[PDB]
Every structure is written in structure tokens, then in C-alpha cells.
Amino acid sequence: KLPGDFGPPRGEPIHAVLTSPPLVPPPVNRTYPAKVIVELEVVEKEMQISEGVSYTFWTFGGTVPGSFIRVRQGDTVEFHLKNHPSSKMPHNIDLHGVTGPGGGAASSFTAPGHESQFTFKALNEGIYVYHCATAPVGMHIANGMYGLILVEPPEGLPKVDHEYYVMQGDFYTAGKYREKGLQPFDMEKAIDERPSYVLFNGAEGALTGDKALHAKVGETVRIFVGNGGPNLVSSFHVIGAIFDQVRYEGGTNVQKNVQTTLIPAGGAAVVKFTARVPGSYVLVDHSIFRAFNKGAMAILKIDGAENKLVYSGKELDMVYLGDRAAPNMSAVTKATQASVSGTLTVQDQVQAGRALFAGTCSVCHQGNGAGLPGVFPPLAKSDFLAADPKRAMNIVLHGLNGKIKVNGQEYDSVMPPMTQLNDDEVANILTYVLNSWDNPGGRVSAEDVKKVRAQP
Amino acid sequence: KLPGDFGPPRGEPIHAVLTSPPLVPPPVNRTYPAKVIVELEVVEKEMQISEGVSYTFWTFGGTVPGSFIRVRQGDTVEFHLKNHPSSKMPHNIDLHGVTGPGGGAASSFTAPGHESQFTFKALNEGIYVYHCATAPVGMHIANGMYGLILVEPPEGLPKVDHEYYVMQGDFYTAGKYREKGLQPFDMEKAIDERPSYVLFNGAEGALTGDKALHAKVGETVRIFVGNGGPNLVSSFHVIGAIFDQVRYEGGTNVQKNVQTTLIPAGGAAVVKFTARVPGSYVLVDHSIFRAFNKGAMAILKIDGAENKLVYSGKELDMVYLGDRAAPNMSAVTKATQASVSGTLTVQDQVQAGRALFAGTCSVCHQGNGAGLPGVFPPLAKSDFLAADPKRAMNIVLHGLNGKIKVNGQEYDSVMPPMTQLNDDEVANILTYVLNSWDNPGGRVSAEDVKKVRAQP
Amino acid sequence: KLPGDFGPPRGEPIHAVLTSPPLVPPPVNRTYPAKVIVELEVVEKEMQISEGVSYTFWTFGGTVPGSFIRVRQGDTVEFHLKNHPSSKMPHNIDLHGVTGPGGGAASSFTAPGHESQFTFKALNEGIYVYHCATAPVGMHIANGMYGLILVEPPEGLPKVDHEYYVMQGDFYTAGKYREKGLQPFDMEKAIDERPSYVLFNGAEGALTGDKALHAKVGETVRIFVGNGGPNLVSSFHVIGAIFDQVRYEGGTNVQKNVQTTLIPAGGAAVVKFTARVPGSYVLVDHSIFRAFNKGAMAILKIDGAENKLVYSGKELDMVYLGDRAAPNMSAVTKATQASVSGTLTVQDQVQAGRALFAGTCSVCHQGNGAGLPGVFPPLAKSDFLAADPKRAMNIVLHGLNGKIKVNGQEYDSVMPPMTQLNDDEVANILTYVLNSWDNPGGRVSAEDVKKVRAQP
Numbered sequence A, B, C: 001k002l003p004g005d006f007g008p009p010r011g012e013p014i015h016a017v018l019t020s021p022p023l024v025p026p027p028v029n030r031t032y033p034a035k036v037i038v039e040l041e042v043v044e045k046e047m048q049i050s051e052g053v054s055y056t057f058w059t060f061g062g063t064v065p066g067s068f069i070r071v072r073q074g075d076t077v078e079f080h081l082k083n084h085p086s087s088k089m090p091h092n093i094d095l096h097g098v099t100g101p102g103g104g105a106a107s108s109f110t111a112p113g114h115e116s117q118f119t120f121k122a123l124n125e126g127i128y129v130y131h132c133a134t135a136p137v138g139m140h141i142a143n144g145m146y147g148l149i150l151v152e153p154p155e156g157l158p159k160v161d162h163e164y165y166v167m168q169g170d171f172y173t174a175g176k177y178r179e180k181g182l183q184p185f186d187m188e189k190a191i192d193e194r195p196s197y198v199l200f201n202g203a204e205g206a207l208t209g210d211k212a213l214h215a216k217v218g219e220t221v222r223i224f225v226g227n228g229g230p231n232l233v234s235s236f237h238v239i240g241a242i243f244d245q246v247r248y249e250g251g252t253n254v255q256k257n258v259q260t261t262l263i264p265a266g267g268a269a270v271v272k273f274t275a276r277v278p279g280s281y282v283l284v285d286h287s288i289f290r291a292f293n294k295g296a297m298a299i300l301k302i303d304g305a306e307n308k309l310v311y312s313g314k315e316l317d318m319v320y321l322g323d324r325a326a327p328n329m330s331a332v333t334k335a336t337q338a339s340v341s342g343t344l345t346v347q348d349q350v351q352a353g354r355a356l357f358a359g360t361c362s363v364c365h366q367g368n369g370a371g372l373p374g375v376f377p378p379l380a381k382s383d384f385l386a387a388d389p390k391r392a393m394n395i396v397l398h399g400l401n402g403k404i405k406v407n408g409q410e411y412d413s414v415m416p417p418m419t420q421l422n423d424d425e426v427a428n429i430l431t432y433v434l435n436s437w438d439n440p441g442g443r444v445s446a447e448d449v450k451k452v453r454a455q456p
């Protein structure tokens, strides 16, 4: 009598169904223990962590997080790890929930071009993080080597309408947030736990806009929530909703009716959500600068009838979500590609600036640049802008306060500095503004902003 | 059948009673669902975050945290948000516990001089954070835009003798801890989660000394504990006591008999305390440098009979609480004002130095400067001090070790450096010491300390 | 009727049995309340925080964490604190679980050479942190002044086969991780919560290798887990296993069947582990850079029969644990001593480099330097190494990529930079490699690495 003692494996071996985020393999739907064969392949590959920002990820199965594994408590798992011949590093795995030293690390050590296997019985029901366990472990985990394995209870989880896979991670780029180009891993930021990005599913906007999760009013949604870390603890929160329940790993304790829950580094939870009114529900790390300054936001979008007795308000918009209220920011991807190619047009910059202007600028100056007479000066046919377009660069970088006059109206207010914006973002935003609302046109270049940022 | 389905509103509309911290509105004390009208006004205003340190807070209702809202599960809330015409920024609100996208953010968007409303049914019982949800959200939250809303269970919470409102926040000033003057918000420290202050209720000493919470031996105290963040998770702890219970948001789980509990960023809990012996109980973030180096301490002061069989010890003092054992440090406020005015007297400095000397210096050199023969040299009629008063500045900033002689007694010990003290604090402490215990008198200036700090 | 109201003390006074980590005093094994006399002495002393790295710890009872205290709920504790005459600082104590202001702080204030006492009834059952409460509190806690006190329930905890004492802390050295020499406390890193070390029981390798905790297959292990902080929250995790249960302080909630659990700063928990298969189980802070870059790993080593049906895999090794897979790194201690003495031999460096080569280098280049043809170039009789031994220093510090040829085989791969290695570590590793596998011999000095690190 160990736990998860259900018998020796019966029937034929089952090849495990591994899914890519944000999807989950189907419930095993069986009453007997099985020998489950898992084949997982490590791939090292460049992917976009943000628009026009590439990163060399180390992946289980080509994604961050890695492929989702689903087995049944009592199963015997024969775990095959392949390391693709293109890999430069060796890799291995530690699966939380494994009973044995290293969670499989020693026996799963796998050089590029090789394959390893070890076998384990899944004694422990629950949701568990797996990750690479190769020195230096922090580097392998920071580069994206984590995912979830579910060990079902023998009777399976209660049925829901949808099951999704969401995994938080902290990332450490040499360059700053949204600085374009291929970004190396930064060991110094990693050791200090100062990530440049905090993401769901390996990228900014991975689960926003046209990539949101979906359900309908009345449906139940189970989310398998991982925190791969490596270093951060998530104040994991759903905006505008509540979790019916939150259960950590294989724990006996189940919390019900909470909105904010702490997920340890390396931790995992199953949360349940019941859709009650339509609109966009935001999954965040409520350490707010992560959610709103580093990418740590995901969307569950609910379709169906409004319930005015429950909520009279409008759908989420750019005031809260900023530039992620849109379907995508693919104009920024295209403008960055054109810059690298030396083929950047005015229109490339305009469309990029339009994407970034949302929230960042429109919260005060409005979508149409009209502002609000006497409170927020207009950017639309702005005489003050026209009178010295170049100074707009200083205003964005270093802010503006004091008495000014715009389209012959008096303002005495404060525009905070926005120095975190990269040279290309300032250039594109300002090029957008100059080419909108009958402004004079022309363009601002990243190089122009670089020169101004460097002026003391 | 949604939750909190108690009927349509009955009776007349109720104007919500909003309280300022640390007080709470009274229990709604009713058996029927109501239409509750809430009017909350945003005010941007300078307040003292520390003695002689001003900060431009963004507030719900003129305080940090913002006004406390109390309604009943099943109530229909008509939420009016006004943004005062003096505001420079637009603002809005996201109330945790609201069922709907953004927790009210889109419909509550409110320019300076304007008013917005949206309606929501309070389906979810519990204690919930609300906060501003205006891009850039981290900035609005960092500037103080958070508070708590309680949704009572339909039968109301159990009666206690006292209900208080305590909310932790992390703050990001350009200047260092206790550097005097009007301190701007520092976006860089905020993004990096490196706060200069960690406070309860928007200021150092907000809940210490003459501003402590009160109760008596035998009474029960309920505290509504918020963490507005934006970024920090509180290792929330009561020194010298225990919580009878800790309940997060609307959760079904209630923890009992704990002293230390983790509150997520954006999280809230109700804690219960039973006073058993008199004295000062300290609420801290037990990430100790926050509690003892950044302001994260609050006091619950208990009156009544000593129980020597339970505790024989003395009341908290300056050894633990340092300069917050006193009623206030208002001498520091007055000395800083006089400096700005150019009217700083020797006595202004003396009284300021006396406030700061407690804990900081008195732990070793004693309240009376006598020290302890052969262990801690005296500052009282100190020949070593008199022999070169100027060098006292180097001793405070950079510490002192090695063999010295003072009032013809031998010392060979270590005075740690105290370089975190600002120029004005060193000047005032040393001016206090020179004017006490028959020392030679004179004064040390901030400018003198500035010159020494700059010497290599 | 207060809690823990079991009567007045009966029988003779009991002198409390205090143990040194990782051991625990025996169960009190009694059915009556007692007067328990505790005598705890503060000692300030240099100890090795890492091999060849000394730190001036401030200790309760000569260890970090301090001596373990065990009493029974309902006991009257007469607490004597002595501060050894060698101390330079005054000290005192705050015991979590004490009912009274400061947890004993005011009455336990104790100058060097003095003794204090206060009395308290242990009303609250549970595991509790104690720590020093002397301004500046963060400094005293950072220097090691914490431990655990257990208050047993009146019937005692359930019997287990083993009880161990593990306490996490964050430490703040002026120098970087593994920089040799006597390291001062760094107030700036402490205030910023940027520790250089994160340790169990006051040192790197305190609970690894020949110092691992032990049990056998089938036995139950209770671990009293403290987090003294001062600042960090532990994502406390056991690699390759599960906790049967996790109970915080005196809480009524008990979590069962979890692998990862958040321990607040100043928090404590009792965890239970049932050994099911042999090998090394790693206790970590799963904020991974702490566990793998700063020292936050401890071992529970299980003896007994392999269960191939549960786990087919091999024992933990250097791939995961790196240089802590070995019994000790005492060659590094000896090489550092010899350097300070000016008697550093080639063999001293070789044996030190051999200790550090494990994981750090062997994960790719193998234990025998053979590498893996076409993937990892060999260090064994390496023509590329021999061709310019000096350049090996640049390769270690700054990494190597691009097409190279070694023992006439083509490589085009990436060796990451390893700039975190100190001058002495690079020197010793390279001296080890030059003196192994028929390489040319010679030696590299710390001074050689210093010059290269400084080259731009």
C-alpha cells in the first residue's frame, strides 16, 4: 500500500497525446492503469517574445510552455526525451509529481542528437510543473524549459466546457522591454530576479486580442495555471471575475471564491471559472508593473447576452489594456522587419505608431487626437506640434508641464515623461501623429530620438 | 440561480457611507437587498509621506488608502466616480468582486471635472481591493489609488468590539528614504519593484505613536487588511500576538491561529485579534527591511490589566520600534519646514536630532548618552567628541572601529556605518548631541555632512 | 479561559534542552504543564558561509539558525538571554508565539557581558520563528539571529522516525557569490532585498554531501522549516518527492500532498515526508536562481531497496546538483587558505579546480574531458587548449561561439560566458584542466584572470 496503487498496467501501451499551449490533451477517460509512453523532444529556436523582438528559446516540444502531458494516477510512464540534433546544449527533465531523485533528471540527461528514457509510476494525482534540470538550471528554465503534467484522479476531473493551459514565466533579456532585435539571455538580471518580461505562454500578446481564450455565458472553464518562474511568485488574479475554485498541485485543500491567489515559483494550480456576463477577463500577475509594464496579461473572452441587472458597464478597452485592447500589434512586427531590411516607409511607421498610440497616448489625447479643451491639449491639427515638430521628441521622452497655448487655448497641466519608450516606438508614434488629423506630415526616425535621448 | 441572488432591490436608495482610514463604515444591518448609490471623488494632492517629505498622491476620497465602501451581498450598486477639476490625469476604477469586464474600468473612465457611473450587482461576498485602472496603471496605483470594498454576507459578519482599515502599499520616490522635499514618482524604481517606502495607510507613522489603533484587554478587533501594492507581497505579521483568524477576499477557507500570512499584491484579508495582555502590537511586513527600514509598521495599542502569569515583560520601546516608539516625530517636520524657510535654529535641529537619536543611537549610547563603561563609549560630556566635533560626522556616516579612549576609558569595538542617514538627519542628530549632557554646543549643518559624505 | 490554560506549573523546574541545527530536542513527553527555564547565549563569531568565505555571524547559541527550543502548550517559560562578553552589539529576542508586546524584546534587551530574563506562558501551540529585535533589526536578522521554538500540543505531535531542523535565510555580503575572504554585511543589498547568498542552516553545503539528512525507505521524516529571512519568501520545494503534510505555525489548516509551498519571511512550517524510494531529495527555494546560483539547496538522503516499478531512474548527480553532488568541496577551502598564506601549490589549484569543474564544466565536456565528438569539443589532450592556454581564460569568462577545430574535428556551437566565476575559480578550474588528461600542465593564477577580466 503506496498511494496510487491501482494495479500493474493493463491493455496495450498508450502513446501519450501531448498538446501545445493553450490547449490540453483530452481526459484519459479510463478506469484501468496503463503503460503510457511519452516522447518529448527538446528544440532550441528563435521565436518572437514581443513584436520585432526575437529570443533563442529552449523548448520542450517547440513551445513555451512545453507540451502538456496528461496521465492517470497509477499509470506507469515510460518517459522518452529526445534532444534535437540542432540543439547546442544538453538537456534533461525533472517532473514534479515523480517519486524519485531529481524527478527523472539523472536518467533523462540527453546530449544533442541523443534520446534517453526512464520509467516512473504516477503515484501522486495533481497538476505539476516539469522543467529542465541541466546545469546551469536557472539558464535552462529562463530560456523557456518548463510545462505542466496532469496526473488525473482515477475517476477523472469533473467535466467542464473548456480546459486551457496558461503558464507564467519571467524572462531576462540584455536589452530593455520592447527593445527590438535578437535579445540574448542576461545572467545578471536573472541572478538579481529583475526580469525584462513577465509573460503567459512565452510571448507578449500570446493570449490577448485575436489569441484570447474563448467561452460563452453559462459555460465552465478549467485553467491549468503553471508558474515556470524561474524566480517570480505570481499574485495570480482574474480582472472582473472570481475563481469558483483554486487547487494547488495534488493538495487536499481547495480554496473557493477567490480572485487573487499566490502561485509559488515552480508551482501549479487548477482554477475553475463560470462565465456569468460577456466581455474580456484578464489573467494577470497583480504585481501590477508585471501585468502592465512587462507583458503579464492574458484574456478569456466571453460571448453571450449582457445581464444589465449584474453589470451595466462596457467591454474592456484601451484605457485599462492599453495597446493590447486591439486584435494584434502586427504593424509593429512589420515596421521592425522593414527597418532591419532598410526599407522602412512613412506608412510602416504610421501603422506601427497607430498600434502603440492606443492607451499610451489616447488615454489623455483621445483616439482622434482631439484631447479635451482646457484639460488635454489636442494633437489633431495641433499648432503647438506644427510650430516645432522636433520638440515633440523631448515632450514624449521627458514630459511637459507649465502654461502652454495650443490651438489658442490655455493649458497648465502635467504630461509625465515616457522615457521607457524605445527610440523606434517614439519615432513611430510621432510619425503616426504627424501623418494624422491634417498634421504637417514628415517622419521622425529612431536615430532622431536616439540623438535627443542622449542630449542632457 | 447566480450567487448573491437575493431579489431585486427593495425600499429607497441608500447613499453609501464611505469612511476614511483607519475607520470602517458601520455594518449595513439589514435583511433585504438595496440599491446603494456610491459617490467617490478622485483628488490629486500633496501630502506628507514622511516628516518633511511631500508626495503628490492620487486619491479616492482624499486619503491613501481611499474611502472604505461597505455593501451587502445581493445589493445593486450604482457607482458614481467624480474626478475633481483640479486633477491633471483621467482616472477610473476596477473593484475586485465586481462581475464584469475591467471591474468597472471602461464605464468609469472620468476626465478631470467630469463624473461617470456604472451599475453592478454585488454577487460575491468578501473583502476586495479596488484601484484605478487608467494607463499607465502601475503609476496610478503607485501614487495611491487603491482602497477596500467589503461585501457583507447577507447575515452580516459576527459582531466585534472594533473594526479597523489597514492597507499596505509600496511607493517609489526619486529620492532615497527620508530625503526631505517634494519627491516625484520614480518609474524606474517602480518597474524594478525597488520601493523607497513600504507603508500602511499612505505615510510613515500613519498608525504609530499618537495615531495607533486602540482596544482593551478582552476585546475583539477585526482588521480589514489590504495590499494595494502595486508590486509587493506582504509577509503580514502581528508582533507579540496571533490572529484568531485570517480569511482572504470571499474565500471559503478560513485559517485560524497564525501570526504570519502572505497577502498577494492586490489581495485583501479580514483578520481577527483578541486582546489578551496590554501593550503595543506591531503590524508589519515581515520582509524585515520593509518594516524597519522603509516604514512598514502599524500599532494596535491595548489598555488594561497586566497578566504576569501570561507575560512578565515590559511594553515595546525604542530598542525594537526605534524612532517610532515616541508619540510622533513632529520636531523633524518643524526643523525641515524651518530649513526650507531659511530660519533653521539650533533648537530646531536639537529637537529633530532628539527624535532621530531614539533607537538609531540610544540602543548603544543610551537615552542619556552615558553608554556602558568599556562596551559603549559615552556621548555625555564626551572628551573624544569635544576633541574634534567635526570627525563625529565621519563616525556616523562611515562608522568607527579599533582601540580608542573616551573619558579616559579604553574601547576596542565596532560602530557600524550609518550611511543611509540623510545629511539633515546626521546634522540634526549631531547638533542634538553637541547641545546635550554638557557637550560643547555649536551645530552641524546638512551642508557640513554633504561635504564629508563627498570626501573619499 | 484563555487558550493553553492547562493549570499552573507542576513539579520541579525543567532546564530546557536546546539543540543545534539540524537536530531537534526530544519530545517533552509529559501530560502536565511545567516551569521551563531556557538559557540562550548570543555569540558573535566568524564562520565559513562558503568555502574560503568567512562572515561575522551573530548567533543564538553559536549556530545559524540558533538553538532549537521545545516546550509544551501551557508551559510557563522563564527565558534567560545572555550576551557573551565578546559581543560588540547589544541583542534581545522576539519569539513568535509569545503573548505580549515585542514577543519579549523590551525585557530581553542585553548588553555584552549581561544577562536578562522575562517570563511568558506558551498559550499558542505551533512552530514559531524567534529572532533578534535590536535596532537596526534587519542587520541583526541578516547576520543570522533567528531560530525556531516549537510549542507542542498537550498530547505531543504524532511519532515519526526522524525530526530535523532546516531554516532558510537571505545574506548580504559586500563581495559577490563565492568571492573569497572575510565578507562584511552589505546594508545596501539588504535594503534592496538583493542577497548574495540564500542558504539553509547558515552556509553553502550545510546540508549537502557528507552533511545530508538521512532516513530509510518506509520511514517518516518531520522537518521543522523556518524562514528567518530577513527579506525573502521561499517557494519551498522538495525535488523528486511530495510532502504528506504542511502546517504553518499553530494554524488549524493542514495542507496535504503538495510539493511546493510558500513560506513567508519570518514564517515557519512543519512538513512530513514518507521515504518511498532511495536517493537524494533536494529541499530548495524554487525561485531557482536562489537554489542553483546562491546556495539554497539541502539534501535528505534515503537508504534502502530500489522500487523499479515506481522509479527506474538513477540517483541525483552533478548534472542537476552541480558541484554539490560531491561529499564536500574542502579542496576549495584548502586552496583558499594556501592563497592567503602565500603557499598555493599547483596541486592545491588542481584539487580545487576538480571540485568546481563538476557540473560547471563536466555537464558538456564530461567528467573525463572527452566531450562528445562534433557536439562538445574535448578538454582531454585538447590541441586547441595547448595551442594557446592563456585564451582558455577569455573562453571561460566571455564564452566561445563560431566554427573551431579541436583534435582535428569541426565544431560550430555556443559555450555561454561564465563571468560570475571569481578569478580564483577560473584559475583553479583551468589549472585542473591543464594538469589532467595529458594536457601540457602549468598553472593559471587569480591575477592572470583578473588582468583578462579587466581587458575590454
Ligand code: HEC
Binding pocket: A357, A359, A360, A361, A362, A363, A364, A365, A375, A376, A377, A378, A379, A382, A384, A385, A392, A395, A396, A400, A401, A402, A403, A404, A406, A411, A412, A413, A414, A415, A416, A418, A429, A430, A433, B089, B090
Ligand atoms: C495624460 C497623462 C497624457 C498622456 C498619456 C500623454 N499626454 Fe501628451 N500632454 C498632456 C498634457 C496635460 C499636455 C499639456 C502639458 C502642459 O504643460 O500643460 C500634453 C502635451 C503634449 C504635446 C504638446 C502639446 C500639443 O501639441 O497638444 C504633444 C505633442 C503631446 N502631448 C504628445 C503625446 C504623445 C505622442 C503621447 C503618447 C506617447 C502623449 N502625449 C501622452 C497629457 C498626456
Ligand code: HEC
Binding pocket: B357, B359, B360, B361, B362, B363, B364, B365, B375, B376, B377, B378, B379, B382, B384, B385, B392, B395, B396, B400, B401, B402, B403, B404, B406, B411, B412, B413, B414, B415, B416, B418, B429, B430, B433, C089, C090
Ligand atoms: C551600537 C551598535 C552603536 C550604535 C547604534 C551607535 N554607536 Fe556610536 N559607537 C559605538 C561603539 C562601540 C563606539 C566605539 C568604537 C570603537 O572603535 O571602539 C562608538 C563611537 C562613537 C563616537 C566616538 C566616541 C564617543 O564620543 O563616545 C561618537 C561621537 C558616536 N559613536 C556617536 C553615535 C551617534 C550620533 C549615533 C547615532 C547616529 C551612534 N553613535 C550609533 C556603538 C554604537
Ligand code: HEC
Binding pocket: A089, A090, C357, C359, C360, C361, C362, C363, C364, C365, C375, C376, C377, C378, C379, C382, C384, C385, C392, C395, C396, C400, C401, C402, C403, C404, C406, C411, C412, C413, C414, C415, C416, C418, C429, C430, C433
Ligand atoms: C555546455 C553548455 C558547456 C559548458 C558548461 C562549458 N563548455 Fe566549454 N565549450 C563548449 C562548446 C560547445 C565549445 C565549442 C565552442 C564553439 O565555438 O563551437 C566549448 C569550448 C571550450 C574550449 C576551447 C575548445 C577546447 O579546448 O575543447 C575550452 C578550453 C573550454 N570550452 C573549457 C571549458 C571550461 C573550463 C568550462 C567550465 C568552466 C566549460 N568549458 C564549460 C560547451 C560548454
Ligand SMILES: [Cu+2]
Binding pocket: A058, A089, A090, A091, A092, A132, A133, A134, A140, A145
Ligand atoms: Cu535544458
Ligand SMILES: [Cu+2]
Binding pocket: A094, A096, A129, A131, A266, C286
Ligand atoms: Cu522543480
Ligand SMILES: [Cu+2]
Binding pocket: B058, B089, B090, B091, B092, B132, B133, B134, B140, B145
Ligand atoms: Cu488614476
Ligand SMILES: [Cu+2]
Binding pocket: A286, B094, B096, B129, B131, B266
Ligand atoms: Cu486589481
Ligand SMILES: [Cu+2]
Binding pocket: C058, C089, C090, C091, C092, C132, C133, C134, C140, C145
Ligand atoms: Cu541582535
Ligand SMILES: [Cu+2]
Binding pocket: B286, C094, C096, C129, C131, C266
Ligand atoms: Cu518576527
